[PDB]
């Protein structure tokens, strides 16, 4: 189906925005990590081979946070793990088509687990065990993300999506972090197998390749009808967080794009703490692949305004004729035509340039917006400044948040996660016995008060 | 041309299979049972391996462990890409490249006809004939490249391989193959530094 | 026409090549083991005493947590084949068409 | 160091473990092993992989 | 109340790893660190 659906080459041919670096608006919300030029994938596919049938051999690691770095003292343990043969999930196509209809990884023959032991002298290996087994000191691992994430739905064409949280104790809360996920590409993780996941391409939910991150407009953080969480008149619009301010009269955009001023300040302060002492490009090591500054991309273009040119004539695609007589009519086919002066791209330069109106937006992806739960938005430690303040106050407040997202014609998901602490305290007191005690402070998940 | 001997441009270290070390025909040096294979070092276990390969190539699970252990000490706390400063241009991980293709197997394919180069014709009529000369031919359907995709998906067998240039295989003379010091611990014991041992 | 009977007008046919699709395992083999599903969850237990120590919640996804951790340690631009680490990296030019 | 860093006895460095029991559903594969960390040796769980 | 007992036990606040570990381990882990590091298993708090 998605082959044999010819696209008119004149849609995006050599004269679209002939001067500027403008992201093609129709494919602004199309997933960009599905491409023959996605160098991460085309290497990951040619690794298996170039044929249809591949007797593969892989070495899947272990990535659970309490097991990834455990140091197992000399006991004798079981180790069971359910794998997954869903071709739509383990595989990854490039068109994002449905691989369940075509061909599947039929067999897992002989999965077997390997382990490597450091050959240590039995004198020290016994001494090391003798004290590592002592309950005074035992391993403790915190999940790197450390965030209880929940998915709220957003129907088609919806703009205002409100959420809520019932009254709750915000003991050690480190902030929020949110993005948008198209609902046609996200698995029902709680099920063993969901037959309604017609997708193969990149899955931003559990993969990390967010692209729809630029369609938010406003955010409000209401604490049980109190003023917004930053509401000590601490912003340019202290009642809520502008993000993608539209046509606006006052001077509040920033960085040659439409991203507002405070939001840039909040984002820059959160990742790098470079807000108050002037703005400068941060350290090369300090900004990573999934950091804000590396992916921020402003862009702008100017198009013939229609309401002031006095001669504008909106010509639909089938009728425009540039470069005619030397290319196909509406399909990439044999060239047909006559030569003749073109009419489609209205000139924007020279002595005959038409009046125009500039439109400027930005293209930020592969990151999730962050709003640190700190008094000055900085990162002065793990246990944030206001986290300890809740503990001293020792009271519970409900949270109410609303968003304004750009409308889309397909249902999506608001993927918002609350930063938490997700530490464990694995302790092994005797031979062949592991006792792991889990704590997750601001959003606990335990039925036992010790 | 370049002389690999004295300027460090080695390119043939991908054609070794097994290195066996014996001290005066005693038990092998690599140790008592330090290796998955019983009594030798195994590389390029290419012909067939029931469960010993790494990185979707035809290396050995122990040879990879040894090599990464001698260079970056990344052997026991799990594998990871080494730091940039610790990975030079003559080091193992920088120049290690696995690869594999999908030639058409002839034993199991129903109708396979091995056509030699002078007889196979593809893209004919629009190109030269056995020489980069003026195009000659007629057009016709082609025949040489056997398809591997689509509805017609003739069965195939997969052969893997790897290239490793500008790198010398290393077998440190240490008990655990680490780099705990310039003067190794094994090359310091009384057994080796107070007697004479042969080597095969 | 609408026939494949090798008619006269069947001489004039054109054929565009099929669109490229490349299919292989995901980065770091995400999705190949069920992580974070309380139904099919793993078990690392002290066999003598079947006390599972991998109590896993329904929400916190360890696939997304691991990708961020991988980026924090070192940088994800060198392709590690063994773990199959190869970050999906869209071409910078194609997303933002700078038409010069 | 020479004194007490690494052993002189016989020990493997890499161990493979075959599944004790296996369950191959239409869309699953449930493999259960038994790690056996013998006496006088410690295993760092980061080294293990399937 | 900047420290709750559940927090100090799980190492969200309080002493860092160089302190609450027994003196035998700290001396050990400092010694065997060129090889077989033990410094990524005991987490240490960083309050603000």
């Amino acid at each position: 189906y998605m082959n044999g659906r010819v696209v008119a080459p004149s849609l995006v041919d050599a004269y679209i925005n002939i001067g500027a670096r403008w992201s093609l608006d129709p494919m602004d919300n199309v997933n960009p990590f599905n491409h023959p030029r996605n160098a991460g994938l085309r290497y990951r596919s040619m690794l298996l081979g170039n044929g249809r049938y591949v007797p593969f051999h892989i070495q899947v690691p272990q990535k659970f946070f309490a097991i990834k770095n455990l140091l197992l003292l000399p006991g004798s343990y079981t180790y069971e793990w359910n794998f997954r043969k869903d071709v739509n999930m383990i595989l990854q196509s490039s068109l994002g088509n449905d691989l369940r209809v075509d061909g599947a990884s039929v067999r897992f023959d002989s999965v077997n687990l390997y382990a490597t032991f450091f050959p240590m002298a039995h004198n020290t290996a016994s001494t090391l065990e003798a004290m590592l087994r002592n309950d005074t000191h035992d391993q403790s691992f915190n999940d790197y993300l450390s965030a209880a994430n929940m998915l709220y739905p957003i129907p088609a064409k919806a703009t205002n999506v409100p959420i809520s949280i019932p009254s709750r104790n915000w003991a050690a809360f480190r902030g929020w972090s949110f993005t948008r996920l198209k609902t046609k590409e996200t698995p029902s993780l709680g099920s063993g197998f969901d037959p309604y996941f017609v997708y193969s391409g990149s899955i931003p939910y559990l993969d990390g390749t967010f692209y729809l991150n630029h369609t938010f407009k406003k955010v409000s953080i209401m604490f049980d009808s109190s003023v917004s969480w930053p509401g000590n008149d601490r912003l340019l619009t202290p009642n809520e967080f502008e993000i993608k301010r539209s046509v606006d009269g006052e001077g509040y955009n920033v960085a040659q794009c439409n991203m507002t001023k405070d939001w840039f300040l909040v984002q820059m302060l959160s990742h790098y703490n470079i807000g108050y002492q002037g703005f400068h490009v941060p350290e090369g090591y300090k900004d990573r692949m999934y950091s804000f500054f590396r992916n921020f991309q402003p862009m702008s273009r100017q198009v013939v305004d229609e309401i002031n040119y006095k001669d504008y004539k909106a010509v639909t695609l089938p009728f425009q004729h540039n470069n005619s007589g030397f290319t196909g009519y509406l399909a990439p086919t044999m060239r047909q035509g006559q030569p003749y002066p073109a009419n489609f791209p209205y000139p924007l330069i020279g002595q005959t340039a038409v009046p125009s109106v500039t439109q400027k937006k930005f293209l930020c992806d592969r990151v999730m917006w962050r709003i640190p739960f700190s008094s000055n938005f900085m990162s002065m430690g793990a246990l944030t400044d206001l986290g300890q303040n809740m503990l001293y106050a020792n009271s519970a407040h409900a949270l109410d948040m609303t968003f304004e997202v750009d409308p889309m014609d397909e249902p999506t998901l608001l993927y918002l996660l609350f930063e938490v602490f997700d530490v464990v305290r694995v302790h092994q007191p005797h031979r062949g016995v592991i006792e792991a005690v889990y704590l997750r402070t601001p959003f606990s998940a335990g039925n036992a008060t010790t | 041309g370049s002389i690999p001997y004295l300027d460090g441009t080695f390119y043939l270290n991908h054609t070794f299979k097994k290195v066996s070390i014996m001290f005066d025909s005693s038990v092998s040096w690599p140790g008592n049972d330090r290796l998955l294979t019983p009594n030798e070092f195994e590389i390029k276990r290419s012909v067939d391996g029931e469960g010993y390969n790494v990185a979707q190539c035809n290396m050995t699970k122990d040879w990879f462990l040894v090599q990464m252990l001698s260079h970056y000490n990344i052997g026991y706390q799990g594998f990871h890409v080494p730091e940039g400063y610790k990975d030079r241009m003559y080091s193992f991980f920088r120049n290690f490249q696995p690869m594999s293709r999908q030639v058409v197997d002839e034993i199991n394919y129903k109708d396979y006809k091995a056509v030699t180069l002078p007889f196979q014709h593809n893209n004919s009529g629009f190109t030269g004939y056995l020489a980069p000369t003026m195009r000659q031919g007629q057009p016709y359907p082609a025949n040489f490249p056997y398809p591997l995709i689509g509805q017609t998906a003739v069965p195939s067998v997969t052969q893997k391989k790897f290239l490793c240039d500008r790198v010398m295989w290393r077998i440190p003379f240490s008990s655990n193959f680490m780099s705990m010091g310039a003067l190794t611990d094994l090359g310091q014991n009384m057994l080796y530094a107070n007697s004479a041992h042969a080597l095969d | 026409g609408t026939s494949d009977n090798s008619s006269e007008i069947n001489l004039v046919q054109q054929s565009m090549p099929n669109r490229p699709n490349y299919i292989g395992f995901r980065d770091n083999f995400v999705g190949l083991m069920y992580y974070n599903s309380t139904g099919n969850m793993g078990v690392l237990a002290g066999q003598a005493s079947q006390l599972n120590a991998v109590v896993d919640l329904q929400d916190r996804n360890t696939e997304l947590s691991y990708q961020l951790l991988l980026d924090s340690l070192g940088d994800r631009t060198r392709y590690f084949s063994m773990w199959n680490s190869a970050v999906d990296s869209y071409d910078p030019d194609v997303r933002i068409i700078e038409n010069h | 160091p020479t004194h007490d860093v690494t052993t002189d006895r016989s020990q493997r460095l890499t161990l493979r473990f075959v599944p004790v029991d296996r369950e191959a559903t239409t869309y699953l594969y449930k493999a259960r092993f038994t790690l056996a960390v013998g006496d006088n040796r410690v295993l760092d769980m980061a080294s293990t992989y399937f | 109340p900047s420290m709750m007992p559940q927090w100090a036990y799980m190492h969200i606040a309080g002493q860092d790893a160089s302190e609450y570990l027994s003196p035998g381990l700290v001396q050990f882990a400092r010694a065997t660190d060129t090889y077989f590091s033990l410094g990524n298993k005991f987490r240490n708090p960083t309050v603000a």
Partner: peptide
């Protein structure tokens, strides 16, 4: 000294030092 005897000797004295008991890093 038994624990301190397991460290490489850079000359005469061992290589112990710079206590690096870490593992606090998270998103932030």
């Amino acid at each position: 000294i038994n624990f301190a005897s397991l460290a490489p000797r850079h000359g005469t004295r061992p290589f112990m030092g710079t206590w690096n008991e870490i593992g606090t890093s998270q998103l932030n």
